[PDB]
Amino acid sequence: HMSFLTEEEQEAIMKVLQRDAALKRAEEEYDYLIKFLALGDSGVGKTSVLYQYTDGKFNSKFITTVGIDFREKRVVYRASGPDGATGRGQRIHLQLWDTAGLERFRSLTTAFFRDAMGFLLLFDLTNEQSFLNVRNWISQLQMHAYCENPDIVLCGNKSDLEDQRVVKEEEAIALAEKYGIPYFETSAANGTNISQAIEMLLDLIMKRMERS
Amino acid sequence: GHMSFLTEEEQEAIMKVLQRDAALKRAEEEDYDYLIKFLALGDSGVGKTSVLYQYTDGKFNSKFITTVGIDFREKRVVYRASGPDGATGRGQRIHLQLWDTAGLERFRSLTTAFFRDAMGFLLLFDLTNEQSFLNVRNWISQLQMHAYCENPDIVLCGNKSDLEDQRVVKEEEAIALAEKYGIPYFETSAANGTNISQAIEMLLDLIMKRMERS
Ligand SMILES: Nc1nc2c(ncn2[C@@H]2O[C@H](COP(=O)(O)OP(=O)(O)NP(=O)(O)O)[C@@H](O)[C@H]2O)c(=O)[nH]1
Ligand SMILES: Nc1nc2c(ncn2[C@@H]2O[C@H](COP(=O)(O)OP(=O)(O)NP(=O)(O)O)[C@@H](O)[C@H]2O)c(=O)[nH]1
Ligand SMILES: *CCC(=O)Nc1ccc(S(=O)(=O)N2CCCC2)c(OC)c1
Ligand SMILES: *CCC(=O)Nc1ccc(S(=O)(=O)N2CCCC2)c(OC)c1
Ligand SMILES: [Mg+2]
Ligand SMILES: [Mg+2]
Numbered sequence: 001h002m003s004f005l006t007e008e009e010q011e012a013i014m015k016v017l018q019r020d021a022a023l024k025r026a027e028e029e030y031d032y033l034i035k036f037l038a039l040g041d042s043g044v045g046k047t048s049v050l051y052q053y054t055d056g057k058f059n060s061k062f063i064t065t066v067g068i069d070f071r072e073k074r075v076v077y078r079a080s081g082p083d084g085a086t087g088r089g090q091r092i093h094l095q096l097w098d099t100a101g102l103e104r105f106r107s108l109t110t111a112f113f114r115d116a117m118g119f120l121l122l123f124d125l126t127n128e129q130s131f132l133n134v135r136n137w138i139s140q141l142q143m144h145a146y147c148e149n150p151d152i153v154l155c156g157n158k159s160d161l162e163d164q165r166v167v168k169e170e171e172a173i174a175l176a177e178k179y180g181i182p183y184f185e186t187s188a189a190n191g192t193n194i195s196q197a198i199e200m201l202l203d204l205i206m207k208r209m210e211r212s
Numbered sequence: 213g214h215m216s217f218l219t220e221e222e223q224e225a226i227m228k229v230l231q232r233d234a235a236l237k238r239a240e241e242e243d244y245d246y247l248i249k250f251l252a253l254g255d256s257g258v259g260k261t262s263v264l265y266q267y268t269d270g271k272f273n274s275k276f277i278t279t280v281g282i283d284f285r286e287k288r289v290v291y292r293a294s295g296p297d298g299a300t301g302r303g304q305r306i307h308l309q310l311w312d313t314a315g316l317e318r319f320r321s322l323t324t325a326f327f328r329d330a331m332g333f334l335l336l337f338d339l340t341n342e343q344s345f346l347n348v349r350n351w352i353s354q355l356q357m358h359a360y361c362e363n364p365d366i367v368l369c370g371n372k373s374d375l376e377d378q379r380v381v382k383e384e385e386a387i388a389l390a391e392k393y394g395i396p397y398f399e400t401s402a403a404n405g406t407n408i409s410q411a412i413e414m415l416l417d418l419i420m421k422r423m424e425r426s
Binding site for chain 2: 110
């Protein structure tokens, strides 16, 4: 009925932080460290999406994120050229930040935005209110990011729940066009579009870094 | 053991600091020659807010207003390197961001988040409070683990040296602790300002000298 920040919950968060300082200390020395961050209302599937992508697995039981967490995955990035071209493959080491969407964690999660080079914004195709909130999330991103106009990839998630969709695809494609951000309908249950969405953000983050 | 979550008012406070930090950071990523960041940490009540306030504005306030999670102050200064046999180089423009962390446990993971941003640390205990000095070992251990640098520069501050009637930390003990860890030590007063600028300038030097090597 009345819940408080338990000691176990804070122990959890401190170990995410210890692990992070560990990861960063080592990188001061595989061949590029690309970080991005997933955000969106609680229950849209941020954790599920990252898990499907790192491990190809899905757990249908809701285990809400205690503040903050992150996964990693070593991948190969090949610079995609114009009209189907690619380029050479340098090794990319991803750090995938995963934030709690609950308000009680808003200030803890908001301080990690500056660690990100790009953002995976998620709403639930079955929850119109999570879609309405995409606007508020985008301005919080502009207001706390590194970079004046940060790279974003919008995901409407739970596309496998067709008989419960309430956000019409047109409303979502139009919102995305309004802001100039790539849009993908995803499903963490079966993996649809998960790899393409993230690979699209990686491409945005690597192409932006080759204009300096 | 029942740490309240942040209230709506506590959280608006912290988001404003985050809003101010991002505006400051975005302006430096594009005037002043370097942005330099310190972070003050230590138990609640040792005088972290008061120390930074004395340093930026030469003022001191007796009423205890405990820090809501996190805050920071700024100061423009001129650092001059120290060369061989006092060969003081050109005056460099330094913009200092001075992070101020709350010391209560209920804020511990929030404030630990910000050890990433620091290039150095001001570690405070209270001279009138032996328990706050005994915890200095844990704090250093924490800093070792969460600093983003290996062997982070620390300056130890034993504060409230103006309350001489109420002093309980023996001087030899703290000099021992500081020598054991190889870190500079200053007894300070946020009230009358004794040693505040010397300790903060010592930390600036460590970081600047640390920066030149690279
Ligand atoms: N059918 C279906 N269920 C999904 C999908 N993605 C997530 N879920 C389910 O939705 C619930 C919430 O997912 P989860 O990743 O925990 O959500 P979250 O966005 O991380 N929430 P929080 O911010 O609280 O950590 C879980 O029951 C999960 O099984 C999806 O693509 N399809
Ligand atoms: N005499 C004297 N009093 C001091 C000194 N430094 C702080 N105080 C007083 O002792 C209390 C400590 O206040 P403060 O600076 O807020 O401590 P803090 O470490 O930032 N506390 P918190 O972590 O809870 O935010 C206040 O009442 C302050 O006025 C000092 O050097 N001398
Ligand atoms: C402009 C989009 C963006 O956020 N770019 C970006 C590039 C590089 C980094 S970093 O982590 O390698 N680094 C920290 C300070 C400068 C170099 C970041 O950090 C998030 C963002
Ligand atoms: C090793 C001592 C130390 O902490 N040095 C240091 C120098 C510069 C920076 S930074 O703020 O310019 N930066 C953050 C991301 C990489 C570049 C930092 O980081 C706090 C530390
Ligand atoms: Mg989650
Ligand atoms: Mg304070």
